[PDB]
């Protein structure tokens, strides 16, 4: 094994041991998806109210 | 009431185990995909170990050890024996073997040039005396292959000058107890051993399928199968020794060595599900009464006379141990 | 000093956030009224604990935290709890009616109406930061708010804070405490949408916590309080490096650097020990380090013996010196199956904090002299994904409950799109560890 | 504040509705004057779900009483808890509905429905955050069946995003008033398929059999039947009325129980059902009985179908470890009766406050494909008359056409086959 990067301070210490070496969508796009889902809800409600109106 | 599922329709052993479970009246079989089981008789390949032990309120047990394939694949068995300190490159009961990808081909040529120089290649088996014809045959295939020294001096049964191998059935329960079934079987060749004719693969191969397709199948014993009582009597009459002293002590030692070596890798002692598994060990005996390990089978079939006893023993020690209801095994202590 | 903002979303995130900030105050000696006698720089400072606490001129130490939930009952217990004086009303955001265990309702329907308010309140906290390094987000997979609104928030945070790191603490659904049948749907939907916006995510399976509470704490039927006090101890062990002096994992970027070499495979496995009943012998460095390789102590039940490691961090609290860690590691490596991938060093990064773990007075956890949390990025955690994706497949083949999601304006194609991403994620784990 | 608006319509709907408010008022410590007199804050913690707060901390049921004749309502007003109800919430006519769906739905009920929607609106307007509505009614009469489903349709038009829940009493020739009950029920069921999120199917056949066989009541009255219903209604609403984690509101319950929108008809059950009682019940006994067919209120054999979803509610002081234990016991013993393509489809809740006169009880709510037997029964009785157009003149006299009956029959047979589809899947 090999210990490396041993740092010590008052509240503790840290180090590394090696056992072996090796061998986004924009604001516009998000708003678009939110409004498209909103419009699909509005369309489904309008179809219901149309059904109830019949 | 205990519940189990069946997922390998081709298993001879566990088709009988499920029968005995239903015969107790205290076990109930479910559909293949029902996750609410106590016992799974799983498929051979890609058993979903990751989905076991996650059903609230159910103790779940499967008939396979995850990771046991390393012992039951010929290539990985050779690598395991070489690279494991517990077994080591020194290992005396395992034939000198080398893994050849179509890799340790240069270390094989070195030990071969030092040198009887007959080897055998297997994954479709070639037995040759020159290394060039072996390596050419491996590269003609696409699967990873292994070659090992062919046992040029096997113990030959008389009369017949006959080769044979010993199959031992070993059950390892969820506590990693190692149980050796007291009844083994000898798969015997029917033709006299021919040290100058390795092209004829009938007197050199003792498999049941190969001997049932040699014109002496069933001559000396039924189905080329000799059981332990007769073999022990032969050893006493012919060689003034016993099966236990001359062979079985070495068999029990090899079974213990192999299974203890992988125990930390496959044990389910503190796992969220439990495992047991039935293993088929294949041994070879030379003329000096030294036992060699040939192969470990992870999904073995049983001897047709021994199905009833061995499967009941599976229910007794592997299943009812975890699920109690309302010895044919030799416990190999370790 | 660089500040960290914590965001708690939905019931699980909020109740776990409560447990964590109660624990942080005990660890840093902050009283429930917000006063901290050991802090001599009254009204400001750039100490390590200031990463998580701002300060008022009156010497009150205020969490850099925002709580958001779409119904008010859980956050009202924060407004009236032991640490009510800690938080000011702007940090506690409540809606009227929840997402009904429906990802689409949390993400699209209700999330669209509240996202701008949430971001406004986060902006107010960010404006108090001299150098904000990013966000820690606490939420469930299974809840409609924890799944649906979190993923919307994570998208917008990537937009409004492009350079900031985002870490997650995610509660993976377990049927013996779960409240909905559709939690596998919500889990896959939120993982698909969040995957590209999270730099490192610590999954906690309620099944693992539940069984640890039963087995080690002798609690017959654990409650959320029992679960959350254990979870808070693990969370605290993970975030201690941000809150105390040290050299390991001192900023959020180092979590990714030390644990996530491949960006999509950003789900480290956490293992914690010892967990000791307060109603009950002090374990050694070797014993608690050996316990880090027992599945019974993991935050997600899986078998690391049948995967490969990409990284391993050991975080010790209490009486621990490097010599005993190295002696413990040498012993364990000779006796256990620890296989790293070939393109990674077989090594451990060790952090020691001399202060032993704080326990909540009157809680279920005994005070111990040394504890450890191991963070290991192992392919074995893909077992959790395979379990979840399988339950998804069983319901989705019959389209069971899908109408609830479509009825909120989600397209059925988002289901299969999310499921295909998860199938690719399972392929990535297979490509790396087998 | 997650308020629910309660509506009870017609003779059956008002008689079971009055008993329901009688029972839960006692559980919440509310006396017949609307003042609280209990000894636990669990009683008041979610009391706004069903009650408004009046002056002097008086609690008034958020309940609307509807009928097309004054008789039953007069009786309710004279009843034990009669003065508890808001007097403005009594909405009634004089003509009656003559056990005629068309009179309830199209003629007599049409003249009264706007007055009811005015009272619904006034209650809904003072809701901090209305969850939705619960309706109690029979399907075999005229007002509860015909006007009740008219109300559901108009309530949906006005509150499209709110949950609609009903307790619907299904007619049986064993406990019948008129021969036309299968007509009224078939017409109503199609309304419920389209306009309700959750319907508790209460079969008068099952209630009678339980009273006679199990309770040892030789001559059961409607009062005896309503004892089982109000006890069941208290059990199924326990998750809404007390602090809880599971199925705590109407929308969460529907999301957990309804995998396909039309299959929202539940078989309720209750335990214990015992003859007149001091003997302590154990958790194994509660669990076995609540899943027993003889404890279910829909006269359908669960063993003839498969459970899509199940919600179980245990009440009283008992071991949650034992509750979890026995509940997992039942699933893992008869896992063939639960569909496998909905994993973990049985959800359990526990409430500490037991019902009156019991230390422990269990309420069962099942979405089982066996409910098709109930709709098959009604369809057979409908067809036996409709093939000869018998008694149709009562309905064509109110303006209905034979084609509306044919459509209703076709609609309910479609519902039956939809259940059979998922029973074999
Ligand atoms: N460990 C833990 N898990 C919790 C807690 N609260 C809820 N859960 C789990 O979270 C999942 C349910 O999601 P919740 O967080 O309750 O729901 P939510 O985020 O508020 O979303 P909605 O209520 O649907 O709007 C289930 O798997 C619960 O077991 C908690 O306090 N601690
Ligand atoms: N090194 C060696 N020396 C001598 N004989 C050998 C040998 N390797 C293999 N054999 C013979 O070849 C036969 C088959 O060998 P192997 O066990 O590799 O094949 P196999 O896996 O098909 C048998 P099974 O499937 O029944 O376990 C054995 O019966 C044995 O007699
Ligand atoms: N369980 C129960 N069923 C009732 C009661 N009263 C009537 N019924 C049933 O309801 C149907 C008659 O409907 P009813 O409510 O009297 O007609 P309405 O006043 O026009 O709504 C028949 O199936 C009766 O068996 C009651 O008090 N309890
Ligand atoms: Ca300061
Ligand atoms: Mg083989
Ligand atoms: Mg919630
Ligand atoms: Mg009547």
Coordinates of C-alpha atoms and ligand atoms in Angstrom, one line a residue, chain C residues 10-12 15 69 98-101 140 142-146 171 177-179 183 206 224 228 231, chain D residues 252, ligand 1:
Chain C
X10 CA -42.2 17.0 -0.5
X11 CA -43.0 15.2 2.7
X12 CA -39.9 12.9 2.7
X15 CA -39.2 15.6 7.3
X69 CA -44.3 21.1 -0.3
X98 CA -50.7 18.0 -3.2
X99 CA -49.7 16.0 -6.3
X100 CA -51.7 13.0 -5.2
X101 CA -48.7 10.6 -5.8
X140 CA -38.6 11.0 -2.4
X142 CA -42.3 7.8 -5.0
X143 CA -44.2 11.0 -4.1
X144 CA -45.9 13.2 -6.7
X145 CA -44.1 16.3 -5.4
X146 CA -40.8 14.6 -4.5
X171 CA -35.5 8.1 -1.0
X177 CA -43.6 1.8 4.2
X178 CA -44.8 3.0 0.8
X179 CA -48.1 4.9 0.3
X183 CA -44.2 4.8 -7.1
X206 CA -36.4 2.7 2.8
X224 CA -40.7 7.8 9.8
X228 CA -35.3 9.8 9.5
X231 CA -30.9 8.8 7.6
Chain D
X252 CA -54.7 9.8 -3.4
Ligands
LIG1 N1 -37.5 7.8 4.9 C1 -38.6 8.5 4.7 N2 -39.5 8.2 3.7 C2 -40.6 8.9 3.6 C3 -40.9 9.9 4.5 N3 -42.1 10.5 4.1 C4 -42.5 9.8 2.9 N4 -41.6 8.9 2.6 C5 -41.6 8.0 1.5 O1 -41.8 8.8 0.3 C6 -42.7 8.2 -0.6 C7 -44.0 9.0 -0.6 O2 -43.7 10.3 -1.1 P1 -43.9 11.6 -0.2 O3 -42.6 12.4 0.0 O4 -44.6 11.3 1.0 O5 -44.9 12.4 -1.2 P2 -44.7 14.0 -1.6 O6 -43.3 14.3 -2.1 O7 -45.2 14.9 -0.5 O8 -45.7 14.0 -2.9 P3 -47.3 14.2 -2.8 O9 -47.8 13.9 -1.4 O10 -47.9 13.1 -3.8 O11 -47.6 15.6 -3.3 C8 -43.0 6.8 0.0 O12 -42.1 5.9 -0.5 C9 -42.7 7.0 1.5 O13 -42.3 5.8 2.1 C10 -40.1 10.2 5.5 O14 -40.4 11.1 6.3 N5 -38.9 9.4 5.7

